[PDB]
Amino acid sequence: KKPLGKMADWFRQTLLKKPKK
Known about the structure:
structure, 0% strand, tirap, signaling protein, phosphoinositide, phosphorylation
């Protein structure tokens, strides 16, 4: 998994309020 994809999910949880799963 690319760090970029990891950060993408990080933003999805952080900003879009979508818990990673």
